[PDB]
């Protein structure tokens, strides 16, 4: 059972650490003390998963490795060489901290890289975010914060992105609608919007029909004046 | 109840290579010690240490020792 | 040889037997810790720094058959094929500050990819550009066409597919259009969740 009260850091791991009977290797600069009481008993799994959060807590962070057992760091970072990346299939558990990386395929991976990098500004040496011509989309944060972001980017891209849909036409003329749709359903002296989330409208001649392209909540008003 | 003025700091559950482990602080200073090894400070013997409530043969009696 | 204005200590408990190869492994591993870095020779053994850096003439380069293991420095080179070899350098640079004079990112006109680092560093690399670089760089596909007109069509494309307000994205991951009109098919090249888009359009 976690039954620690006023337990110092140092004392934590190196008590812990002898039930656990895995080495460590703690830094210095680490000073400071927990204090906790428990009713539920914690050793199966559930010993090591809440270990490693009490050490979150703190934002004193640890990595840990194949050969020799993890370690405590004081830069708190993934830039020390050590950082586990998940392939999408193993999203981990919070406690521990990878570097995930998803090519975005549809959206401008800028503008959503300062609201990111504000909402999970971890300031204890958390994520960042950056831009490549490919698209990629990367992030090292925590394990938990995979969940929120992985679920924001997939509900955000998957908002009606470009689809495209026709209407034949029986006798009417089709170069002279659209030659004056765009004047009807134009713009107003303040843009709806940008470019995106709005329709545009072209038309061939051969075989009078004309052409819709946008999502499924701007094209049903385009049907609705056709 | 016990006493001796010793005030627990830890008492973890036993390790698996070994058959118990406790921690206890005295005199400011904190000192691991297992179940059969002798207090550095009083001539004591701890019997058993159990996860309640600590056992220790002081002056051929037992004491049982409460959580801080 | 130990150097000078080398001033500390440490405090362990282990509980395993490490002197086979761990031993050595995490020997170099707690000098790594502190950031005290050493450099292993072959005729004598190794020397402790206090500068951290690569920059000491000796830099044991590996070939991507052997990574070697995080606790050793290394100096590892890639020619990255598809992408511009600045503006992750920045990113790179960043990520992998090393605040221990670890590695450095250049780009040459010959698109080497170079840096020093660590040899634990190399594996979270090493995997990124290949997973980066592998993100469906330009192919081309063609289709037939059975008896619509094709300059027409194309003509026609970038009237209805083709800018926004604001750019989708830079000049990548969007295709671009030609035809001739000699086998009235027409030709696109671009990314495999690009181009699905332009087939539906046809």
Same mark, same amino acid.
């Given at each position: 059972?976690?039954?620690?009260?006023?337990?110092?850091?140092?004392?934590?791991?190196?008590?812990?650490?002898?039930?656990?009977?895995?080495?460590?290797?703690?830094?210095?600069?680490?000073?400071?003390?927990?204090?906790?009481?428990?009713?539920?008993?914690?050793?199966?799994?559930?010993?090591?998963?809440?270990?490693?959060?009490?050490?979150?807590?703190?934002?004193?962070?640890?990595?840990?490795?194949?050969?020799?057992?993890?370690?405590?760091?004081?830069?708190?970072?993934?830039?020390?060489?050590?950082?586990?990346?998940?392939?999408?299939?193993?999203?981990?558990?919070?406690?521990?901290?990878?570097?995930?990386?998803?090519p975005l395929?549809?959206?401008?991976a800028?503008?959503?890289?300062?609201?990111?990098?504000?909402?999970?500004?971890?300031?204890?040496?958390?994520?960042?975010?950056?831009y490549e011509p490919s698209n990629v989309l990367?992030?090292?944060?925590?394990?938990?914060?995979?969940?929120?972001?992985?679920?924001?980017?997939?509900?955000?891209?998957?908002?009606?992105?470009?689809?495209?849909?026709?209407?034949?036409?029986?006798?009417?003329?089709?170069?002279?609608?659209?030659?004056?749709?765009?004047?009807?359903?134009?713009?107003?002296?303040?843009?709806?919007?940008?470019?995106?989330?709005?329709?545009?409208?072209?038309?061939?001649?051969?075989?009078?029909?004309?052409?819709?392209?946008?999502?499924?909540?701007?094209?049903?008003?385009?049907?609705?004046?056709? | 109840?016990? @006493?001796?003025?010793?005030? +627990?700091? %830890?008492?973890? #559950?036993?390790?698996?290579?070994?058959?118990?482990?406790? &921690? *206890?602080?005295?005199?400011?200073?904190?000192?691991?010690? @297992?179940?059969?090894?002798? +207090?550095? %400070?009083?001539? #004591?013997?701890?019997?058993?240490?159990?996860?309640?409530? &600590? *056992?220790?043969?002081?002056?051929?009696?037992?004491?049982?020792?409460?959580?801080?």
């Open positions: 059972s976690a039954s620690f009260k006023g337990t110092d850091i140092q004392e934590f791991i190196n008590t812990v650490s002898k039930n656990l009977n895995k080495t460590v290797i703690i830094d210095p600069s680490v000073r400071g003390t927990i204090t906790v009481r428990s009713y539920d008993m914690l050793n199966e799994e559930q010993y090591y998963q809440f270990f490693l959060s009490v050490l979150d807590v703190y934002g004193f962070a640890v990595i840990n490795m194949n050969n020799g057992v993890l370690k405590v760091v004081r830069a708190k970072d993934a830039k020390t060489s050590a950082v586990p990346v998940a392939s999408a299939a193993a999203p981990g558990e919070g406690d521990e901290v990878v570097t995930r990386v998803v395929t549809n959206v401008a800028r503008d959503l890289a300062p609201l990111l990098r504000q909402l999970n500004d971890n300031a204890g040496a958390g994520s960042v975010v950056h990367l992030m090292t944060g925590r394990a938990a914060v995979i969940k929120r972001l992985l679920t924001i980017v997939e509900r955000v891209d998957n908002a009606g992105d470009r689809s495209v849909v026709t209407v034949p036409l029986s006798w009417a003329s089709a170069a002279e609608v659209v030659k004056l749709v765009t004047e009807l359903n134009k713009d107003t002296s303040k843009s709806a919007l940008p470019g995106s989330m709005v329709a545009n409208v072209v038309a061939d001649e051969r075989t009078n029909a004309v052409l819709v392209s946008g999502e499924p909540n701007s094209r049903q008003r385009i049907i609705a004046m056709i | 109840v016990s @006493s001796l003025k010793l005030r +627990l700091a %830890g008492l973890l #559950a036993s390790s698996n290579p070994a058959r118990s482990i406790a &921690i *206890i602080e005295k005199g400011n200073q904190q000192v691991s010690l @297992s179940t059969g090894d002798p +207090l550095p %400070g009083y001539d #004591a013997r701890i019997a058993a240490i159990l996860p309640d409530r &600590i *056992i220790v043969n002081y002056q051929g009696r037992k004491e049982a020792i409460l959580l801080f």
